[PDB]
């Protein structure tokens, strides 16, 4: 019914009120100390006071680091922005990697503003233009002003327009008898559709039909809106939504990331500080998750060394599989987890332990219950032995072919013959490696 | 169309019990790999499982790409199958992660339901009011069948579609209201007043009967990447064809994910998954492997099929060697289907299937020598030699292809080992690796 | 392989014949335009569409030029001025082509050889957008 994909079983960190964790709750099994550390981190995050904090989720492969990051995001909520990332995603061909990292830093910080909108909406009853006395004078436009008549429900008003607002009106291609929506904040117009008071069974353009808008014209309504600071930086660097010629030409041109200067970010900070001082906007700091942080070179770590010192920079969590591994982009500097020792001092390493046999067994059982598979006890034990023998992920990813073989053999339960056939058909890494070492023609 | 190297596969050749026949649907042998590919096919057809990587491995000239195209033919209609190679990821305007994400979002599909009105009748009159400069276009249409006659108002796009495919009165046209199609089925009046300018000779059609407007419901398939380019900029439809989709932002992706979830919950749209096939996967970089590792674990992620013919070799972008050229963390997430080399009977059956497809008739002894040559050097060499033996036979003005023809073809065209033995004996003739050569005869 | 049924030749007259019962509020209600075409060994008078007059004034077609109207698409193509009607003896900049040969109504089969890459690069580029 519902599409499952990878660690969908996680519903949260599964902690208690005192700050402790139960063994099997919240979709997790084990890793009690890592769970409690991430709970203290998410409490620090909800405190909304510190900036430029960083932790590291260290450990081997297939150990639960990305699971812990997803659990943190689910414990945080939708209003707090979670910005997932991979280390390889910072290498863009349009713009330097430093600006991509700073754009992600600004993308993590959220904002929630209540906004007041001045709205003229209604049905266009009349629409007359007034020409100029010298239409080919070269200066000014071919019309002078335009009178338009809008009636909402239980109201009627006549509007006299300057040529720019009517230029937007005719760019949205209104006609007599259409329901329109003038936003006086930007001059943007939205054509709602034909009024349904007239006959609605004769058009040939699949037009929607809408009743009269309730209330008077010249409404003033309050909208709550959730935006990030990166949205403000992008919207000011590529200005669209105005009605001048720069905003009109900005829509049609090809978008391209540019190195946003520090002056724009400082001006956006001053404006958001004014919005906060007005009491209309609140600051919501969030997270940024660089999975596979070993993929970054030394230059991104050098820029992080300064970008964590900002007064607005969020809390950033990292993951790494490496042990004593040389840093990418350097020649002889060998460091733990592929992370240079300057960044390790700002970091707070959260270790993550490997699993046991029974923990693997209950993880496989929970994955079978998530995927709506029914498994007998003997096949579950055999899959647990296979997990401890080959790998955990090879045991988790073998449940689906046993399900396919089960519905092939007109059964729902997974017998031992099904997991034996799935062992035969699909190989793990080690058996395929032994096949590689015992072949001549580079199989 | 033309005939290609994998044209003989017309499916995968398995039963309802997922048991392969010895030779069915143009495929022979490879029983375990065929059964495993059928299992992965049924797992795709279920659709509730997402982001599972399947790695096909074996020696060259075995049928890994043949197995992949067999899965593609058995995949059915309206299911995406993005078949790229390893080197399309590297680009000058796209990042590697962005090109991979574009491939991933091409491979997954959305089936959208729409409501459509069908109008078909004779045209009584057309009145079109265009402005002085021709910009604003508005007017009325009066279409008619034998039971009732209705008048519609026209918009700009319908009138512009009316100007092309010029519609005189008394022309039976079909109007699709949603798609905006105009289909002149013919002319039904055949008026005596005929214009000497116009050269149309549209066929006479019967007057339509029944009601004028007919409601129908249609379904069409569009991938996630197409809607991403469409919503990315104003002229996204042109960038769908010219490929000028330069690094679409993440906000667009988040909003289209929420939107297609909303369309799923309304019953309007249905999300079907697909198979993303990479050929020569070892050509990728290590950062591509890390992004594949962290992008298989997403809700919208297809069943990635991965093919390599390489043993333990150096992984690109790194200084070490790894099995299949793939690092161990990607091999952890991937289940490996292995393939095995053929015997003389399977090679004979392959060559017989190839000759039966390629419209070439062979004798028994020519087939035996082709089987022996195929089991000697390579299967692809004999499969290529069928063509030149056919052409030599038609140059000798005989319908069949004889043993002498394939012997002349074997003498005429060289294979790998013979060309190696001819290079090694004449090392002064060709340019060496140090760039030293003797072009003079003496 | 394609066929083309075309009309071309020197123009003799262009009369926008007004309609009987000429509506109201609009002057010049054309019922049809009569264009008299002449060429070598043939001369034809034609009864065209009311709408092709907009192309006639769009391409600046007057008496003394050679035009090119097709049967199916219905578009003029002003090739130039005839050599005989070189009335501006002193200073003019019009192109002058000879009067075309054959009948005015010539229908011929034309072959076109084109690569698939030309089709791809013609489909990919914007084909007359008339936008900025």
């Amino acid at each position: 019914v519902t599409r499952t994909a990878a660690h969908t079983h996680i519903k949260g960190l599964g902690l208690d009120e005192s700050g402790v964790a139960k063994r099997v709750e919240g979709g997790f099994v084990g890793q009690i100390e890592a769970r409690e550390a991430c709970g203290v981190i998410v409490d620090l995050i909800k405190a909304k006071k510190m900036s430029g904090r960083a932790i590291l989720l260290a450990g081997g492969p297939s150990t639960g680091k990305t699971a812990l990051a997803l659990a943190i995001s689910q414990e945080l909520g939708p209003k707090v922005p979670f910005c997932p990332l991979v280390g390889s995603e910072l290498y863009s061909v349009e713009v330097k990697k430093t600006e991509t990292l700073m754009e992600n830093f600004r993308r993590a910080i959220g904002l929630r503003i209540k906004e007041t909108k001045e709205v003229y909406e209604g049905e266009v009853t009349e629409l007359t233009p007034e020409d100029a006395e010298n239409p080919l004078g070269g200066y000014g436009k071919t019309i002078s002003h335009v009178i338009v008549g809008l009636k909402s429900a239980k109201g009627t008003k006549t509007l006299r327009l300057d040529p720019t607002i009517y230029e937007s009106i005719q760019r949205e291609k209104v006609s007599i008898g259409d329901v329109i929506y003038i936003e006086a904040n930007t001059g943007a117009v939205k054509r709602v559709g034909r009024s349904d008071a007239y006959a609605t069974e004769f058009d040939l353009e699949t037009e929607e039909y809408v009743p009269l808008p309730k209330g008077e014209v010249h409404k003033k309504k309050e909208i709550v809106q959730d935006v990030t600071l990166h949205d403000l930086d992008v919207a000011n660097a590529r200005p669209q939504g105005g009605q001048d010629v720069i905003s009109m030409m900005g829509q049609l041109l090809k978008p391209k990331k540019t190195e946003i200067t520090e002056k724009l970010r400082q001006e956006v900070n001053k404006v958001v500080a004014k919005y906060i001082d007005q009491g209309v906007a609140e600051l919501i700091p969030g997270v940024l998750f660089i999975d596979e942080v070993n993929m970054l070179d030394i230059e991104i770590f050098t820029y992080l060394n300064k970008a964590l010192e900002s007064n607005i920079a969020p809390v950033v969590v990292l993951a790494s599989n490496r042990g004593m591994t040389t840093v990418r982009g350097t020649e002889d500097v060998i460091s733990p987890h592929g992370v240079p020792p300057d960044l390790i001092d700002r970091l707070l390493i959260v270790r993550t332990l490997p699993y046991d046999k029974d923990e693997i067994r209950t993880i496989i059982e929970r994955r079978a219950t998530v995927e709506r598979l029914q498994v007998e006890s003997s096949a579950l034990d055999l899959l647990a032995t296979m997990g401890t023998e080959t790998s955990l992920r090879y045991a988790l990813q073998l449940l689906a072919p046993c399900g396919i073989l089960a519905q092939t053999s007109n059964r729902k339960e997974i017998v031992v013959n099904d997991v034996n056939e799935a062992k035969l058909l699909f190989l793990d890494a080690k058996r395929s490696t032994k096949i590689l070492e015992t072949s001549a023609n580079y199989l | 169309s033309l005939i290609a190297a994998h044209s003989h596969i017309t499916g995968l050749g398995l039963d309802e019990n997922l048991q392969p026949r010895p030779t069915s649907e143009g495929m022979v042998g490879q029983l375990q790999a065929r059964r495993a590919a059928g299992v992965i096919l049924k797992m795709v057809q279920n659709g509730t499982i997402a982001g599972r990587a399947v790695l096909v491995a074996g020696p060259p000239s075995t049928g890994k790409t043949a197995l992949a195209m067999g899965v593609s033919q058995s995949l059915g209609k309206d299911v995406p199958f993005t078949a790229i190679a390893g080197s399309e990821i590297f680009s000058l305007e796209l990042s590697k992660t962005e090109a991979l994400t574009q491939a991933f979002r091409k491979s997954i599909g959305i089936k959208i339901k729409e409501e459509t009105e069908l109008i078909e009748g004779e045209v009584v009159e057309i009145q079109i009011d265009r402005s002085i400069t021709g910009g604003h276009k508005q007017g009325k249409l009066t279409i008619k069948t034998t039971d009732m006659e209705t008048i519609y108002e026209l918009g700009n796009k319908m009138i512009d579609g009316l100007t092309k495919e010029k519609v005189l009165a008394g022309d039976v046209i079909s109007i699709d209201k949603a798609s905006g199609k105009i289909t002149k089925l013919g002319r039904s009046f055949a008026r005596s007043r005929d214009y000497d300018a116009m050269g149309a000779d549209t066929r006479f059609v019967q007057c339509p009967e029944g009601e004028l407007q007919k409601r129908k419901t249609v379904v069409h398939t569009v991938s996630l990447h197409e809607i991403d380019v469409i919503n990315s900029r104003t002229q996204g439809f042109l960038a769908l064809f010219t490929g000028d989709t330069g690094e679409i932002r993440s906000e667009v992706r988040d909003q289209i994910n929420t939107k297609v979830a909303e369309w799923k919950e309304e019953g309007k749209a249905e999300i079907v998954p697909g198979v993303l096939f990479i050929d020569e996967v070892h050509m990728l970089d290590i950062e591509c492997f890390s992004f594949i590792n962290r992008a298989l674990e997403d809700e919208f992620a297809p069943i990635v099929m991965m093919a390599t013919n390489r043993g333990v070799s150096k992984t690109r972008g790194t200084n070490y060697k790894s099995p299949h050229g793939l690092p161990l963390d990607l091999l952890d997430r991937s289940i490996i289907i292995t393939t095995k080399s053929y015997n003389e009977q399977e090679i004979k059956t392959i060559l017989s299937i190839r000759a039966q497809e390629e419209e070439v008739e062979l004798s028994s002894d020519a087939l035996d020598l082709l089987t022996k040559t195929g089991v000697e050097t390579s299967l692809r060499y004999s499969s290529n030699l069928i063509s030149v033996a056919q052409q030599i036979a038609m140059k000798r003005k005989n319908n069949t292809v004889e043993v002498e023809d394939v012997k002349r073809a074997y003498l005429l065209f060289l294979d790998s080992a013979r060309s190696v033995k001819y290079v090694q004996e004449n090392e002064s003739q060709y340019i060496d690796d140090q760039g030293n050569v003797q072009i003079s005869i003496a | 392989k394609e066929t083309k049924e075309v009309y071309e030749g020197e123009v003799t007259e262009l009369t926008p014949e007004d309609a009987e019962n000429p509506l109201g509020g609009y002057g010049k209600t054309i019922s049809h335009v009569i264009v008299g075409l002449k060429s070598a060994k043939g001369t034809k008078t034609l009864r065209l569409d009311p709408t092709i007059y907009e192309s006639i004034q769009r391409e600046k077609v007057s008496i003394g030029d050679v035009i090119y109207i097709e049967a199916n698409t219905g578009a003029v193509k002003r090739v130039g001025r005839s050599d005989a009607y070189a009335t501006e003896f002193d200073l003019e900049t019009e192109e002058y082509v000879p009067l075309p040969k054959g009948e005015v109504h010539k229908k011929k089969e034309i072959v076109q050889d084109v690569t698939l890459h030309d089709l791809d690069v013609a489909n990919a580029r914007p084909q007359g957008g008339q936008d900025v």
């Binding site: 007239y198 | 009011d129 402005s131 002085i132 | 309609a19 209600t29 019922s31 569409d49």
Partner: peptide, 28 residues
């Protein structure tokens, strides 16, 4: 009852008219 038709404003533009018998073009 039956709803009225939308008001069709045809002032200020040329008219191309095609009917069953003969074709018209009222231009300015």
């Amino acid at each position: 009852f039956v709803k009225p038709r939308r008001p069709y404003n045809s002032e200020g533009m040329t008219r191309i008219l095609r009917r069953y018998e003969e074709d018209l073009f009222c231009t300015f």
